[PDB]
Design a protein around this ligand. Structure first.
Ligand code: SF4
Ligand code: SF4
Ligand code: FCO
Ligand code: FCO
Ligand code: SF3
Ligand code: SF3
Ligand code: F3S
Ligand code: F3S
Ligand SMILES: [Cl-]
Ligand SMILES: [Cl-]
Ligand SMILES: [Cl-]
Ligand SMILES: [Cl-]
Ligand SMILES: [Mg+2]
Ligand SMILES: [Mg+2]
Ligand code: NI
Ligand code: NI
Lengths: 581, 264, 581, 264
């Protein structure tokens, strides 16, 4: 065994090795290993992406106009965000400006996705780390109703409702067909909710599972379908016609009325179900404001998102701020440039890829995706990994760094960036949230904080949906209907050689696509995706990424039952298909 | 009264088929899970992880040997000895084969499991291979699309539960009920196709009247699915209704049939 | 003035005359006049249908296959029931037997209509007679929550919900634009609910207004649209294909799944919202179990409905029983024959029509519809009526009688018939309802009883929807897909001369269509509709109809405010377009 | 802020348009009434009856003279001195004329108000007459159909409120947005029409595959409406989708164009 120091941590692979493979309640394929010391505290953590498809290789030779459709299939969970980044990248390369309504509609598509993804993550992915479903069978329905009514105005709170939910769970479990609940961690000492809160939470899990299907009807109106809506280079294909013959063939007043109806219901659900539940989880799990900090008090990154001025990706336009903090210096939020080769770089010295020199990082315009499965001495064989060898290559995920620093991305990162840039809404929301929990600001830099920030962002996004919808309707009232620019649709209009970057804030964090076009075709297409950052393996300096850092120093109550590991990993909302592409 | 055991496994994929499933409007996915089937293994939704999840897998396929349905999303890569997709430290294909051996029948959800989908598009870096090229001794129902329509997925499930039989299939293993006709044979813009009334450039006057998308590359004429009839997201829309031609996403090899914007 | 005796009433038109024109919260055009004595007690009541269109005339010379589509437009509130009666009549005439699935689907169409119509009537039409909307503004939301939760398991009951509903109402009325609530009867002494029950009921009025739109999706699947779905002579047009190519062009598993989802939701709403609200109205308005009896303790009529054995309209097949009671003898439920010329007859001595002898009744196969607007010696003039003259012709509604007896039809009539025939489900339901109210069985024979029975029937129909759906699915599992018989579709196959009767129980009561076909065309088409019975004018013996009888002897608190009149009339759910056709 | 006053009156009618209105899915009719308009008179829904209802009518048309929208459902009969439809003891036409005189604009809901509908079919016993043959000095927007589509009714209302103007109309006064194209020009069975693939008798094999209904009498080729695109009841179906040809119910005189089962 060995030990070394990095980023304030002592990385020590002595002691018992624990493996969690598969990680479940994530998208895609992940393996995690840790070492624990004699006090059952994690002294080493290893994040491993266990899948690869090679979209960057597949994209070569494609028509740039088609690229969005291919890269959309990086992920069906964060569906649409890769298409958005792609059309932004290709428009940046060629020099295309889209009409205002297309920009507004794209912002609606992104905000819709934030609402959907944040909601489903909270309940269906992370929720069972916090809610003991089986313990809900012990709840008093009247006390559940009382609890719910103390937390929210949400209508669905009657004792008979909670009894009916409980009884349905009882009948579901009674024959032993526990389905998704089988062999769970129920009863673990870290489950701290009382039975009534467990029943309330489980009821809400079911309500959210039903309701989430409605949110994406917005994507169906503008994009045809969800998952995987359609887009175009030059704007959106959903032509508008309000008051002319043939409006039946276009986005018309009835279609817009449907969108409005979904927006209102989405905001209502997030504000009255998700928000109170997140605050309740916080109230009953305050120690988790001190667990899983990782890089969130060191290094955080946002590219920013939601340009409100069409075709302007600068600070005055982006409604979600960008910036970087390093070295724990939150008083100096630094600007990010995605073309600067000294800023974003990816390393592969601990990943299953070939570079000509694996000791250096490559900016994505110089990126290389040459897969090389080479695990070295695992305990086992090449087809039987018993223990990854984290001293050599151990993942399908590349290691991104920013100016050589390991960064955390995502809701917590964004919230910190906006807070420290002095965004007033963010400062007021964060301060009021932490006050309600009677916790210091530093409590947000934690596993609990990641959950709270994601919930808050769903509220923010639901508000922005209405703002964007209103902006669209204002344009329509002024007779501005355009949804596509086609001056540069034809390849004969394009530069012979050009390159571009498309960037945004996906639900999980900072997303970039770097594209180079030559002779009408994609010459290079490199993606660096939020879970690539967060789930990153080590670099030549031995620096650890966000997941590994967040797991470090964590106490496990029961080593064989990885609930604490799952809680912290799930708080990042891992998307492994995204991470590897 | 027991519910039929279902094991849902995931190879190389984007998870769109699982997301599509949970969009179901009728029956709700909640009610499928609670009342119609016993979803006994599913990495996306299950409580257990790691060794606890491996115990569930082993227990279900042993206890219910010969009696469970295997749902498969995604596909196995043959490259790098299968280690482009690793499950419990071993190639995914090993888990696929073990799960298939005990199944009474297999549902191949999506174009990935049916044909290959995006990872199998040129130059197929991982040698991603559809399920029916690996599992050759079991009934496989292909439900293609990227992803398939939510209410198609749930209708196929309810058919099987209610009628206690597999759907009748075409020569490719697709259910006749939803894949027997082409998109273009039930498309509401077909009047415009027949009249020579086409969108020629995005957001032109023709686009604003809902004219046919053939000249914009629509692959409806060669694609079998239910999008133009059943539609998407509780009947709200489909690709063509919102102004984009069909990509062909239910058809084998659709990524490599030329540009989406080149005519059939 | 004059006075005479009929049916145990003293009909006396001395004293003050009150006019209510228009009657609102009904379908179509009605005028009501009463005389009241010094004690504010009604001593005379006059029911007038104030519209006519002439469908029976318009149908002459039409193709019998088209008739359903014309007569469906008798009414958009009870939409579908006239189509059903029509296809029954034409099939009866020609000798067509439909396949079992077509019969099952028709039964589903009818049960769906019962659920929809009964729900909307309870809240949107009758509800404001019982619920003081403005008094809801004085409720305590917590006490409203407690009340709701004591009555039902319905989920939507939180104090915050009731506060939100109350605040929406407060905002609605704050600008002085009271809309449908303007100049109502709010504060009348007959409003007996406490404020919390008013708020509960008003919240439910809004929930029902929203929910009702869902119910009719069943009609859209099988019938294309609602209002006014499509039908065919020979079965239904909605061909079924579950497992063959081209199921996308037919009723397939996805369509049937949609139907099932609506059935479950409909039953849930009726059982957990409507039923407890009907009981609550009962609990707070028990004196109305002794008001508005009318003919309901004397003479009631049902034809029966919902043949469970396809093409068999006998007693062993009809799930909703038929029969008649006269002379108050509920021990003698008599069989009804719609071909017998001595049973159903219509009189016009007090209606605006010509007969060769207006002192006799005509069975519908001998029916005549020859409009004759002749109001005679009114107060005012023939185009400016101040008072109808009920001693001569005073309505566009013909006067149906059964064996010369004036009958009540509708949910209360059916309930009494089924109860006294010993239908087990009916006896159990009625006994439990009346036990919960601590009222004798005779309490159902009243204005309150009409309302209670309608709510009962909605629960019954929602249960039957599931039964019929399950029967359909059993047929499909057995490979029985047929939905149309076409061997007698073509006119050359029909008898040169034939006649038929189509009958059912519409939401408001006994419906019949009598059709004669000659030489391929409609020769006669006569309709007798439930509100024709109930809203009937007098006959040559001076016998009064159900509305006029129910209004007799009613005390009015404030003569200028017709709340008691409205309560009793609305309890019948008047449909004036139906009544006059 | 105050909501626009609306007076909704009813002549000879079946009440299907009112029922259609309350079916609206987006916006809900509840939200139209509470938040978008001030529905100040409506016999179907209002609390007040008789003299109290007459007082509402008088008060609203006086206080808001020149400023209310008049919605009309049904039509006036000219026969029997108008006394085929009586309101407050006088011919309905008097109420129509009084209401029309104060209105800023009139919406003729349905084929009754637009054209005549079933009561005007031969031999028109009451001499039922559409609104625009009686009111000749006010803007009248015709929204035909028996009834019109619920979400068409609500979209027209939201258009007017949002954009603060009447919709643009064709030469017959129908809103171009929903009545500019024929049913047959956006019908999903048009592929079958163009291929000569027709239902020939009910429930034949063609019917079970969703073939075209032209030979069964479909009047879609001559009918302008939104049923084949917007569809009915929150997009669930339309007549053709459920297997019956279009009757032509949005067109003037559709009852007297021959049998519904005779070809167009
Ligand atoms: S839009 Fe596509 S599927 Fe529809 S008619 Fe045109 S080519 Fe065919
Ligand atoms: S079903 Fe009617 S509208 Fe559709 S294509 Fe055939 S004739 Fe035209
Ligand atoms: N959110 C999201 Fe998916 C990831 N990581 C992307 O981009
Ligand atoms: N119900 C109903 Fe209508 C009436 N009366 C009919 O038939
Ligand atoms: Fe639905 S996992 Fe998404 S990529 Fe095309 S089907 Fe695969
Ligand atoms: Fe909609 S009232 Fe019904 S009949 Fe044809 S429109 Fe008229
Ligand atoms: S792209 Fe796919 S979703 Fe349907 S319309 Fe074409 S098969
Ligand atoms: S009958 Fe009417 S409802 Fe539409 S499909 Fe034809 S215009
Ligand atoms: Cl798996
Ligand atoms: Cl493929
Ligand atoms: Cl009126
Ligand atoms: Cl007409
Ligand atoms: Mg990459
Ligand atoms: Mg009659
Ligand atoms: Ni993702
Ligand atoms: Ni009616």
């Amino acid at each position: 065994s060995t030990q070394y120091e990095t980023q304030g941590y002592t990385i020590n692979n002595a002691g018992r090795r624990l493996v969690v493979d598969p990680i479940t309640r994530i998208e895609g394929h992940m393996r995690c290993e840790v070492n624990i010391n004699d006090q059952n505290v994690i002294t080493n953590a290893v994040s491993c992406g266990t899948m690869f498809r090679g979209l960057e290789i597949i994209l070569q030779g494609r028509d740039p106009r088609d690229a969005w459709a291919f890269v959309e299939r990086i992920c069906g969970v964060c569906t649409g965000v890769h298409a958005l980044a792609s059309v932004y990248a290709i428009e940046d390369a060629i020099g295309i400006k889209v009409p205002d309504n297309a920009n507004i509609i794209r912002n609606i598509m992104l905000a819709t996705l934030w609402c959907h993804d944040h909601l489903v993550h909270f309940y269906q992915l992370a929720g069972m780390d916090w809610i003991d479903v089986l313990d809900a069978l012990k709840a008093d329905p009247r006390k559940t109703s009382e609890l719910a009514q103390s937390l929210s105005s949400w209508p669905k709170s009657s004792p008979g409702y909670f009894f009916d939910v409980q009884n349905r769970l009882k009948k579901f479990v009674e024959g032993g067909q526990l389905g998704i609940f089988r062999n769970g961690y129920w009863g673990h000492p870290q489950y701290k909710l009382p039975p009534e809160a467990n029943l309330m939470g489980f009821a809400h899990y079911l309500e959210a599972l039903d309701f989430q299907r409605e949110i994406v009807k917005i994507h169906a109106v503008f994009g045809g379908k969800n998952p995987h809506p359609n887009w175009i280079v030059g704007g959106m294909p959903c032509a508008i016609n309000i008051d002319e013959s043939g409006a039946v063939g276009a986005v018309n007043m009835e279609r817009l009325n449907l969108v409005q109806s979904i927006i209102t219901r989405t905001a209502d659900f997030i504000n009255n179900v998700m928000i109170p539940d997140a605050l309740a989880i916080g109230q009953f799990n305050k120690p988790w404001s001190e667990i899983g900090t990782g890089l969130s008090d060191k290094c955080v990154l946002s590219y920013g998102a939601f340009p409100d001025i069409a075709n302007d990706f600068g600070e005055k336009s982006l409604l979600m701020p960008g910036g970087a903090v390093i070295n724990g210096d939150f008083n100096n939020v630094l600007p990010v440039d995605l073309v600067d080769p000294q800023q974003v770089q990816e390393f592969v010295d601990h990943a299953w890829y070939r570079y000509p020199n694996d000791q250096v990082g490559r900016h994505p315009f110089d990126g290389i995706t040459d897969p090389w499965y080479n695990p070295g001495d695992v305990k086992g064989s090449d087809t039987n990994i018993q223990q990854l060898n984290e001293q050599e290559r151990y993942s399908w995920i590349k290691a991104p760094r920013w100016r050589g620093n390991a960064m955390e991305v995502g809701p917590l990162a964004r919230t910190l960036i906006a807070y420290h840039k002095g965004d007033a809404a963010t400062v007021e929301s964060v301060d009021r949230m932490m006050s309600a929990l009677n916790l210091p600001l530093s409590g947000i830099q934690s596993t609990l904080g990641r959950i709270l920030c994601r919930a808050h962002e769903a509220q923010w996004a639901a508000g922005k949906l209405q703002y964007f919808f209103d902006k669209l309707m204002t344009n329509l009232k002024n007779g501005n209907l355009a949804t596509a620019s086609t001056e540069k649709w034809e390849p004969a209009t394009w530069p012979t050689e050009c390159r571009g970057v498309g960037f945004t804030e996906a639900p999980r964090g900072a997303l970039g696509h770097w594209a180079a076009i030559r002779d009408g075709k994609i010459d290079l297409y490199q993606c660096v995706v939020p879970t690539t950052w967060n789930a990153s393996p080590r670099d030549p300096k031995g620096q650890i990424g966000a997941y590994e850092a967040a797991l470090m120093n964590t106490k496990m109550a029961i080593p064989e039952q990885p609930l604490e590991i799952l809680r912290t990993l799930h708080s990042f909302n891992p998307c492994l298909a995204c991470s590897t592409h | 009264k027991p519910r039929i055991p279902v094991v849902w496994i995931h190879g190389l994929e984007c998870t769109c088929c699982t997301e599509s499933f949970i969009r179901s409007a009728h029956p709700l996915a909640k009610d499928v899970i609670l009342s119609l089937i016993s979803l006994d293994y599913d990495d996306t939704l299950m409580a257990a992880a790691g060794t606890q999840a491996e115990e569930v897998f082993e227990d279900i396929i042993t206890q219910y040997n010969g009696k469970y349905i295997l749902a498969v999303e995604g596909n196995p890569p043959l490259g790098e000895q299968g280690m482009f997709c690793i499950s419990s430290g071993r190639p995914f294909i090993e888990k696929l084969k073990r799960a298939a051996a005990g199944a009474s029948a297999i549902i191949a959800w999506g174009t990935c499991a049916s044909w290959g989908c995006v990872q199998a598009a040129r130059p197929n870096p991982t040698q991603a291979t559809p399920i029916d090229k690996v599992i050759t001794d079991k009934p496989i129902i292909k439900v293609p699309g990227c992803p398939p329509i939510p209410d198609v997925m749930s209708a196929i499930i309810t058919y099987m539960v209610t009628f206690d039989r597999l759907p009748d299939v075409d020569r490719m293993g697709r259910p006749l009920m939803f894949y027997g006709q082409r998109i273009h044979d039930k498309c509401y813009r077909r009047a415009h196709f027949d009249a020579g009334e086409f969108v020629q450039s995005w957001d032109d006057d023709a686009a604003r009247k809902g004219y046919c998308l053939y000249k914009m590359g629509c692959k409806g004429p060669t694609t079998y699915n239910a999008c133009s009839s059943t539609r998407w997201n509780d009947g709200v829309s489909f690709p063509i209704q919102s102004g984009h031609g069909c990509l062909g996403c239910a058809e084998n090899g659709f990524w490599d049939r030329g540009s989406f914007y080149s005519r059939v």
